Design a protein around this ligand. Structure first.
Ligand code: NA
Ligand SMILES: [Os+3]
Length: 129
């Protein structure tokens, strides 16, 4: 599923990401834009042999099991395929554990490089939320 920008803002808000660990909704929408282009099916291989999965590009090194990432953890206790559903529930629940782990949203390289320090609330402007 390729979400609309405001469609994703509404789904992320419904799941309680707005101001989760102090991160306003625009931070999460900006992260999803630059991680996955709002595409729940997005998959991208990392240099270390792990892969990033779904709308928020959650990594198999720590968070999910994809059956091909040796010596990795599965701290969200899920198959990585669960992160590719049109339903973002599993991605959001796992993202709440990630952002609570001490790194905040620095866990997402695209957020650090393309959202952090910017007018992130632009990503929710025009939306009925
Ligand atoms: Na893993
Ligand atoms: Os708000």
């Amino acid at each position: 599923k390729v979400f609309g920008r405001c469609e994703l803002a509404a789904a992320m808000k419904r799941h309680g990401l707005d101001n989760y660990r102090g991160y306003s909704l625009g931070n999460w929408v900006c992260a999803a834009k630059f991680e996955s282009n709002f595409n729940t099916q997005a998959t991208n291989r990392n240099t270390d042999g792990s892969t990033d999965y779904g709308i928020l590009q959650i990594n198999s090194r720590w968070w999910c099991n994809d059956g091909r990432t040796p010596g990795s953890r599965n701290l969200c206790n899920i198959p990585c395929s669960a992160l590719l559903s049109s339903d973002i529930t599993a991605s959001v629940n796992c993202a709440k554990k990630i952002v609570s782990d001490g790194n905040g949203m620095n866990a997402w390289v695209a957020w650090r490089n393309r959202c952090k320090g910017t007018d992130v609330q632009a990503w929710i402007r025009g939306c009925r939320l």
